[PDB]
């Protein structure tokens, strides 16, 4: 059986996790979920626990800690280990009847959990991208450390990408190593994108786009950063540089394409010119259901892809004049250093400050390209501890200039 | 370095093989072509031994040994072996210098140079469909005696969908071996199809075609045979048979798909419902060069895909109605036993009377069907040579009963 943790089992994507474990286990006994992971919601929580009966709970806010004790012996037969905080995460990832770990957390407690998943050489089913963009380096060295550990994406394009990969050739290898796309005979990349609701629009019409404007219409319901990321295509800009680092590809081997129907999730073209890519309706249960598969496949009761339903699939060119937010991905991912850092701590300003109506829709590449100008490239620590440090004193003094930058303006 | 053998080397598959290798081989020597075997083209020979210079060269036609052995002489610094008729192939498939065989003839010397070639536990490239429809049961067993021998397929909606399946899980199994598609996590096939010139035509439009309207102005020039069945889809039910022998798929869970931009070659969704598919532009060079380089692949100075000049993708279901054929192949499918032996047989019979002009286009499936309901079931030979000699009657007596019910309603 597949021995899983969930680490923000409350949230999107752990609720997606779970969800697609419930019903494949319907179908056959694989999944043990054996730890569960949230932030505050006690009551959630306990109606997991009440379900899937992992041998871990945790819980991060102390305030609600002993409710969750007294909750806990509602459940006949059940006598789980009752943990909280940032040390209950850690004998967790620690656990010997742990394999594999969703990360469904965002930000600073999201890179955290993976720094201490991958010590604890476990497999870590990864879908925060702004660590993987923010923090490469680090991870990249971890991995080398820790031989044992994996990283698996879950980012959808990402996901797409690992599935049109031989085994046979990823198992000599694993993502964020060195000679990752040699040892595949990986040639190029077709990063999809929805395009968000703005690709007919003129340059004078986004010129007043508001937050209302991407968060009203959207074709998928996501939260509020990654909809404001996607209106920008500044997500996908991100995913250019999760990219280049997962699958270790030549920013200019990386190309994004603009395909609105969201069927085929991303394509990878072969040294030979052969392309494969991966298909279906849009759901984040196949990704997180592969990562934790991989690298086999298991029985779902999911809809069936009708392709003669779907009838068009199409394909365009994003305008980088539009969306000069993936101008600005490529530029810092290109530069390298920590200008990654930068371009993705800069973005969590300007985005934020166009959520709540302070800027406009071309102010937030603004922004991020002063920030971007104002870097000067630092010489990268050799030791582990000190690049950790390295990154979140970049990733602060960028949050920092882009702030300043608007007050100076306002 | 790769040792391969043409069968065939002035037809199609053969001039694409060394077109694809040549160019290949400049990049990185990779390739030797140690065999060269045609019919008749002596001339066409020569040129190819003076460029590739093989060690084997054969020749079917008794009547222009001498010719050959006469114009090998001017070649420098070379003495090659040179061999005629079916000891000659015989001979080349014999050969401890060849690994890996092309199979591209036709009609009995295609399924003799197959037999042959698995005997001799070779890796045989197989862009022959008709043998596999009416000798699939053959082969099965001959691949179960001689198990070191496989069937690579070059056929390209086989091949993509070959390309599609992990490796990790392909090498442990091969093609025509019972459980294939287990062992592969396989759920079901989408079988592209161009749909052909008579695609658009009402069923008053399609009463009146003609073999010159079939072969004027065509998408993609090839033979004439194959022409003809691209236009009564019989193509595509001949590969629905080749794809459940090839890969051990049920009827049920083969679908044909039109798809008339020929940029997706087929798609395979496995039993999570992911699908995934394999793009290109049509060329039959990216399917030859994989059955040669599999389970890796080698680099090529091929023409990149351009999604976004492509633009747009279409599907949609063919009509059974307007295509017959595509009804009667899956009927003698799930029939089984003899009937693809009698579908394959009747149908290069009526093929070519409309080729000829003798039949209208409905004629075609009318005595297809009316052979298939005549033909009755027999006790598959437990010999391999019995079954062959079984096989080989039942195609002759396929064929008589359809000229047969020319000559009566004539
Ligand atoms: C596999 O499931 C889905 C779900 C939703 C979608 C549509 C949203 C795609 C993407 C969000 C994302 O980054 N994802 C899902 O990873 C927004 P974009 O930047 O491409 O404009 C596609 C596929
Ligand atoms: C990979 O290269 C090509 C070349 C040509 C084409 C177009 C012809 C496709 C097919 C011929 C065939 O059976 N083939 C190539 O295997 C004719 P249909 O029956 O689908 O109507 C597509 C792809
Ligand atoms: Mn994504
Ligand atoms: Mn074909």
Same mark, same amino acid.
């Given at each position: 059986?597949?021995?899983?943790?969930?680490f923000?089992?409350?949230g999107?994507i752990?609720?997606?996790?779970l969800?697609?474990?419930?019903?494949?286990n319907?179908?056959?006994?694989?999944?043990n979920?054996?730890?569960?992971?949230?932030?505050?919601?006690?009551?959630?929580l306990?109606?997991?626990?009440?379900?899937?009966?992992?041998?871990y709970?945790?819980?991060?806010?102390?305030?609600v800690?002993?409710?969750?004790?007294e909750?806990?012996?509602?459940?006949?037969?059940y006598?789980?280990?009752?943990?909280?905080?940032?040390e209950?995460?850690?004998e967790?990832?620690?656990?010997?009847?742990?394999?594999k770990?969703?990360?469904?957390?965002d930000?600073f407690?999201?890179?955290?959990?993976?720094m201490?998943?991958i010590?604890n050489?476990?497999? /870590?089913?990864l879908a925060?991208?702004?660590? #993987?963009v @923010?923090?490469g380096? &680090?991870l990249? %060295?971890l991995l080398?450390?820790h031989?044992?550990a994996?990283?698996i994406?879950v980012?959808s394009?990402?996901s797409?990408?690992?599935?049109?990969?031989?085994?046979?050739?990823v198992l000599?290898?694993?993502?964020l190593?060195?000679?990752?796309?040699k040892?595949?005979?990986?040639?190029?990349?077709?990063?999809?994108?929805?395009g968000?609701?703005?690709?007919?629009?003129?340059?004078?019409?986004?010129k007043?786009?508001t937050?209302?404007?991407a968060?009203?219409?959207?074709?998928?319901?996501?939260?509020?950063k990654?909809?404001?990321?996607?209106?920008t295509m500044?997500?996908?800009?991100?995913?250019?540089?999760?990219?280049?680092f997962?699958?270790?590809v030549?920013?200019?081997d990386?190309? /994004?394409?603009?395909?609105?129907?969201?069927? #085929?999730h @991303?394509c990878?073209? &072969?040294?030979? %010119?052969?392309?494969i890519?991966?298909?279906?309706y849009?759901?984040?249960?196949i990704?997180?259901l592969y990562?934790?598969?991989?690298?086999?496949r298991i029985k779902?009761?999911l809809?069936?892809?009708?392709?003669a339903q779907?009838?068009?699939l199409?394909?365009?060119?994003?305008?980088?004049?539009?969306?000069?937010?993936?101008?600005?991905?490529?530029?810092?991912?290109?530069?390298?250093?920590?200008?990654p850092?930068?371009?993705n701590?800069?973005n969590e300003?300007?985005?934020?400050?166009?959520?709540?109506?302070?800027?406009?829709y071309?102010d937030?590449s603004?922004?991020?390209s002063?920030?971007?100008?104002?870097?000067?490239?630092?010489?990268?620590?050799?030791?582990?501890?000190?690049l950790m440090?390295?990154?979140?004193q970049?990733?602060?003094?960028a949050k920092?200039?882009?702030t300043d930058?608007?007050?100076?303006?306002?």
């Amino acid at each position: 059986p597949i021995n899983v943790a969930i680490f923000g089992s409350t949230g999107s994507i752990g609720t997606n996790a779970l969800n697609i474990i419930r019903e494949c286990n319907k179908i056959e006994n694989v999944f043990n979920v054996k730890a569960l992971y949230v932030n505050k919601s006690v009551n959630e929580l306990y109606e997991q626990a009440r379900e899937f009966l992992p041998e871990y709970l945790c819980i991060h806010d102390k305030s609600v800690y002993e409710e969750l004790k007294e909750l806990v012996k509602n459940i006949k037969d059940y006598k789980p280990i009752i943990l909280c905080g940032d040390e209950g995460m850690k004998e967790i990832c620690s656990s010997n009847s742990i394999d594999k770990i969703v990360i469904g957390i965002d930000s600073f407690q999201g890179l955290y959990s993976t720094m201490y998943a991958i010590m604890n050489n476990k497999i /870590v089913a990864l879908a925060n991208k702004e660590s #993987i963009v @923010s923090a490469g380096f &680090f991870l990249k %060295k971890l991995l080398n450390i820790h031989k044992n550990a994996k990283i698996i994406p879950v980012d959808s394009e990402h996901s797409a990408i690992f599935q049109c990969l031989d085994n046979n050739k990823v198992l000599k290898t694993k993502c964020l190593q060195d000679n990752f796309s040699k040892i595949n005979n990986i040639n190029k990349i077709f990063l999809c994108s929805s395009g968000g609701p703005f690709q007919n629009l003129t340059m004078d019409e986004l010129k007043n786009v508001t937050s209302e404007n991407a968060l009203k219409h959207p074709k998928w319901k996501m939260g509020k950063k990654i909809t404001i990321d996607s209106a920008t295509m500044m997500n996908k800009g991100l995913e250019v540089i999760e990219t280049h680092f997962l699958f270790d590809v030549d920013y200019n081997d990386i190309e /994004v394409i603009v395909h609105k129907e969201c069927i #085929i999730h @991303s394509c990878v073209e &072969f040294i030979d %010119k052969s392309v494969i890519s991966q298909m279906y309706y849009p759901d984040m249960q196949i990704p997180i259901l592969y990562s934790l598969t991989w690298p086999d496949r298991i029985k779902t009761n999911l809809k069936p892809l009708d392709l003669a339903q779907v009838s068009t699939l199409t394909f365009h060119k994003p305008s980088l004049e539009h969306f000069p937010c993936i101008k600005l991905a490529y530029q810092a991912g290109i530069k390298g250093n920590f200008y990654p850092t930068v371009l993705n701590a800069s973005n969590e300003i300007a985005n934020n400050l166009f959520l709540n109506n302070k800027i406009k829709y071309f102010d937030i590449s603004s922004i991020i390209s002063q920030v971007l100008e104002s870097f000067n490239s630092q010489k990268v620590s050799e030791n582990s501890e000190d690049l950790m440090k390295q990154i979140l004193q970049i990733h602060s003094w960028a949050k920092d200039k882009a702030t300043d930058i608007y007050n100076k303006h306002n």
